[PDB]
Design a protein around this ligand. Structure first.
Ligand SMILES: O[C@@H]1[C@@H](O)[C@H](O[C@@H]2CO[C@@H](O[C@@H]3CO[C@@H](O)[C@H](O)[C@H]3O)[C@H](O)[C@H]2O)OC[C@H]1O
Ligand SMILES: O[C@@H]1[C@@H](O)[C@H](O)OC[C@H]1O
Length: 302
């Protein structure tokens, strides 16, 4: 645990949280990891336990062991929770993707959203309702949901989520929304404006922010562009930067700090060895679960 909490310092600026991720394994693999989570971060996103493959492996049969543990740990330690993720083309069981009847898929979709959301009703700050539904050029990704139901699945997902748990912030999350002017950013913006004008309950846009070295400086403009979509809030949902330079990390933190709609930042992992991009050492804590230079840089910038 780092003596100075970047979550505390970020919150001091009126932000909601500076959080990270976890699940049973990383929360119990050693003593430093859960200790770091409790001392320096204020929000948790389950890395894998709330995904479709882990929650509904078979049609209508739910498995909530992992997700229960994550939610219970967070709730037991005063950490906000971001549910992730309800509708996604990746980590989706074959039984879902093989469905070809529109009404059958809508039924399945609604039951999945309803069961997962109902189980944690009132305990979730934000839900990534839809994840990665855009192609790089801004067009809608041809996933089973898009292919079988059509663009209306967007309305259905958000409306179902809104009625199931009106207390959770409903988000659409995506990656590569990292620079103003990028096609995917333009597509995210124009579509959300359209959906909001039609009455679709979208509370926020989540920008993953999986960066390469040097890409930190363009994030401020990207967030400014995303703010034009018209949602109530936006957030950096899965931050990690290859090389973990102080300049990149501080640039990204300032990007959120200086944009009124950015409620918080979630770093996709605590320590490098547990990163899904471990070979690029993209996190704030190193192989010894000790704060890296960037962590202190972030603290001294707040
Ligand atoms: O066996 C499973 C692993 O193969 C799997 O690895 C995870 C893959 O997803 C990672 O999280 C996603 C990263 O990409 C983003 O765009 C998504 O929104 C994230 O959810 C995660 O870090 C990997 O661990 O999951 C774990 C095993 O069950
Ligand atoms: O542990 C579960 C809890 O996480 C959920 O919110 O409510 C039902 C419980 O069984």
């Amino acid at each position: 645990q780092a003596s100075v909490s970047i979550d505390a310092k970020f919150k001091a600026h009126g932000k909601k949280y500076l959080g990270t991720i976890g699940d049973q394994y990383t929360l119990t693999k050693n003593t430093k990891n859960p200790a770091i989570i409790k001392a320096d971060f204020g929000q948790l996103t389950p890395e894998n336990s709330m995904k479709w493959d882990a929650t509904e492996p078979n049609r209508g049969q739910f498995t909530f062991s992992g997700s229960d543990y994550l939610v219970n740990f967070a709730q037991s330690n005063g950490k906000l929770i971001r549910g992730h993720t309800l509708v996604w083309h990746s980590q989706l069981p074959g039984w879902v993707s093989s469905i070809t009847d529109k009404n059958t898929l809508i039924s399945v979709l609604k039951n999945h959203i309803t069961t997962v959301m109902t189980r944690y009703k009132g305990k979730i700050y934000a839900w990534d309702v839809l994840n990665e539904i855009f192609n790089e050029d801004g067009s809608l990704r041809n996933s089973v949901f898009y292919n079988v139901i059509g663009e209306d699945y967007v309305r259905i997902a958000f409306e179902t989520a809104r009625s199931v748990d009106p207390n959770a912030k409903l988000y659409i999350n995506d990656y590569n929304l990292d620079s103003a002017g990028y096609s995917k950013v333009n597509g995210m913006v124009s579509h959300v404006k359209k959906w909001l004008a039609a009455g679709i309950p979208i509370d926020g846009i989540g920008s993953q922010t999986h960066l390469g070295a040097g890409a930190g400086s363009a994030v401020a403009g990207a967030l400014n562009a995303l703010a034009s979509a018209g949602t109530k809030e936006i957030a950096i949902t899965e931050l990690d930067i290859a090389g973990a330079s102080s300049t990149d990390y501080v640039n990204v933190v300032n990007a959120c700090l200086n944009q009124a709609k950015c409620v918080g930042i979630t770093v996709w992992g605590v320590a490098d060895p547990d990163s899904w991009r471990s070979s690029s050492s993209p996190l704030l804590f190193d192989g010894n679960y000790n704060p890296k230079a960037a962590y202190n840089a972030i603290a001294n910038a707040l």
